[PDB]
Symmetry: C3
């Protein structure tokens, strides 16, 4: 106990414990690192203010109610209870779990995860023929059979597969070396797809699995194929590590408290 | 219909009914088109936040009371009731009518209509001699008589008429061909003035009469001469179709409900 | 005199009393000039909103409480009484005085005074060897121990220009705010000597805290890491000062 915020700051400026890289810095090093408590009052404002996590209309316009005709998915982001409840319209689901890191919970993917193939517009269907094919393949336990090789593998290497005028996934995900291949993810072979991302620069048994056999809902490929970044139409190049995103995550790790 | 937002959406991307042009898109096709209900809470934030409709101070600073010594025109934009009442200081007048399209109501012109001649500074009087002349000419039924040709017609073709270092209207409004004449409006002759704008590339059925004989208050000419765009000093080139404006308009058409 | 806001305006467009220079103008000529009353409701929104005075996180995040372990300096900017009270943590002190101009008060300096040397990062210490050397000299009311620090590169932190880089002459361009930091007299005369006997005094002997030099050396502009070139006369700053001068009223 006992040592003040001011006291640690004076000590950390002294030790060089504060590192400054593309500030931002004020937030990572003085707010998150020292685990300062975030009031719901600030979070409420975030969901209610246009451009709060990146370019686009305020979240509560489209998600301002638990009535599915007044709000998409009957998701009410405008109150603390509404946030904690998540989507109401069938199929109902929480968009995060209080006290747990939401980085990969639904609210996190919707704020940070660009839909794939990178740049594809939201008015392309998320239940098209190929997506549904990939879905069934994952359900099937993600087999390396004849069917996969002829009917599934080329989806990652063929132009205009998931919408008009879009590049094959293989354009950007084709090796295990970062530069030039993003997240060290290789989608050219079965072996590469099941291996997943970040397999070199951070373990190989600690790879970020991108297909989870039997569970399409949790498979990062399927998610990126079917989930549009919010607010709809946001440009993929907008900061995925926006301070407001981070502060929101912090408030959730702290218990998503209502005061 | 009794169909939910989500359902309308999954149906609209499939059919291709969603058109994307320079977002904007999220707002026009998902918010306005689907007739989503706008809460007063958001509107309040619009009038209380600086730069909400384009660059400048928050509206409620200058319009925060029905007491004419605390607020210009005794106009209170800070409460729902204040909005509905409008300007209180004599001459008292509503600034919109609940349930009616406000695009050309007082609130609409003050957000979207740049004062003419374009760019003229707001510290130029709005009751100068030329304006009053034009006012009276419209009161008289806008005759094409001897008087008009001599005393009124040149007011649109003479530099520095409505203020210092301002170009003649005739600089930008001189034919019915857009490029080069703005809004296809011609102020060089009586015939052109009564004809009005937008009569050509979209026909005589999208014509916009710009002088309404017997009513200066309703004549778009008189309006542009006397009404400074808000907040004062806002650059003419600021988006005249700001999303928050479009949302403000929507809330008014829905009835300006206070919850 | 008993004319409404609207009436004063019409008289002022007519009189030419309204002057427009790089707007900005609406707030200086219509809000501040006519002393429109500023509501606390707006002021609260200012401390609660990110980027309200320039780039950076909202003030009430780091200063949201009178508990020095939940808010820096035990300063609560999130309530009206919190504001008036100021810093709770020792040394406890108010950050402004209601009814008095706050421009060079603590809240004003933190909004408007870029830390020196210009551009210096906030993770550089403010009780380092050179600065502490200087603190005692002002307390004392020389040439070898104090003076050279203003013409020396990398004095107060790594990769920083010597103060003399920007303050080396008598008039404005190329010397900012007409201040010359190379000699004893230029330092005691102060800035804006072109002045010359009402020049903005920059050192107050016996009082480090009111000496503008000590202030700029030890006080980081808020929010921390804000780029020095961000408008130092932000309209929201000006409105806040207006609210303080009006009595810092809570209703
Ligand atoms: C309309 C203009 C929207 C705005 C503004 C925001 N979102 Fe949204 N959201 C919108 C649609 C059409 C959908 C898909 C609906 C469907 O039935 O498929 C979504 C989806 C979400 C979700 C996921 C819902 C779920 O998994 O059950 C989330 C978590 C979400 N949106 C959040 C969100 C946030 C945080 C926003 C502001 C930054 C935001 N949305 C804006 C439409 C619109
Ligand atoms: C470049 C033009 C790309 C194409 C084509 C595809 N993706 Fe992509 N991917 C790209 C980037 C820049 C990123 C990083 C995140 C960001 O939005 O900037 C990603 C990431 C993924 C991931 C997540 C990886 C993780 O470690 O969590 C997945 C699962 C993914 N990409 C899959 C994927 C698929 C299936 C694609 C084709 C349909 C595809 N990507 C195309 C860039 C590009
Ligand atoms: C002062 C700094 C102002 C700010 C900020 C805004 N407005 Fe304003 N407004 C101001 C003046 C000096 C005037 C004209 C006064 C006169 O006596 O003629 C106006 C006028 C309006 C009106 C017209 C109402 C009428 O009855 O004629 C409207 C509807 C209006 N202003 C709205 C408005 C909005 C929406 C603002 C924010 C975007 C806004 N004003 C800012 C002074 C100031
Ligand atoms: C160019 C430098 C212009 C001068 C000089 C004047 N106006 Fe104009 N006007 C201009 C533009 C670009 C527009 C479109 C709206 C915008 O703000 O960008 C207009 C519009 C009008 C209108 C309304 C037209 C409509 O379709 O409703 C009117 C009635 C009008 N302008 C009249 C007008 C008068 C009387 C002028 C001289 C005092 C004048 N304009 C100058 C560009 C320019
Ligand atoms: C953390 C991320 C902060 C944000 C956001 C803001 N400020 Fe701050 N402030 C912060 C620190 C680390 C310090 C120094 C602490 C120390 O012990 O020296 C300060 C200091 C101030 C002060 C001075 C208080 C005093 O007693 O002298 C003031 C008046 C101040 N800060 C105000 C302020 C404002 C107005 C902010 C938003 C615009 C703001 N701070 C943001 C940390 C952080
Ligand atoms: C530029 C490269 C600078 C260096 C190096 C130093 N200062 Fe400076 N100073 C600079 C500017 C552009 C300004 C104007 C205000 C602003 O923040 O932009 C200032 C201001 C001061 C003042 C106050 C002047 C006044 O009229 O009140 C002081 C007292 C001051 N600066 C002192 C100072 C010291 C002690 C420096 C080195 C240790 C120093 N300055 C370096 C630009 C630059
Ligand atoms: Cu302890
Ligand atoms: Cu029906």
């Amino acid at each position: 106990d006992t040592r003040t915020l001011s006291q640690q700051y004076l000590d950390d400026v002294r030790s060089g414990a504060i590192v400054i890289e593309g500030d931002s810095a004020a937030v990572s090093e003085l707010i998150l690192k020292r685990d300062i408590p975030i009031p719901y009052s600030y979070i409420a404002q975030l969901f209610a203010t246009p451009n709060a996590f990146g370019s686009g209309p305020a979240c509560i316009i489209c998600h301002g109610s638990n009535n599915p005709t007044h709000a998409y998915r009957g998701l009410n982001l405008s109150t603390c209870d509404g946030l904690r409840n998540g989507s109401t319209e069938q199929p109902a689901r929480a968009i995060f779990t209080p006290g747990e890191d939401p980085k990969n919970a639904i609210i996190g993917r919707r704020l940070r995860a660009n839909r794939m193939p990178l740049g594809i517009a939201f008015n392309n269907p998320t239940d098209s023929a190929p997506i549904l094919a990939i879905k069934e393949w994952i359900l099937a336990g993600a087999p390396n059979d004849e069917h996969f090789t002829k009917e599934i593998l080329p989806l990652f290497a063929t132009d205009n597969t998931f919408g008009p005028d879009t590049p094959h996934c293989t354009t950007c995900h084709f090796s295990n070396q970062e530069p030039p291949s993003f997240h060290e993810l290789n989608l050219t072979t079965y072996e590469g797809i099941m291996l997943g991302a970040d397999s070199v620069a951070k373990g190989v048994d600690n790879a970020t699995k991108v297909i989870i056999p039997g569970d399409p809902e949790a498979s990062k490929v399927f998610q990126h194929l079917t989930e549009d970044r919010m607010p709809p139409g946001i440009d993929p190049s907008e900061d995925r590590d926006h301070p407001n995103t981070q502060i929101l995550f912090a408030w959730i790790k702290q218990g998503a408290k209502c005061e």
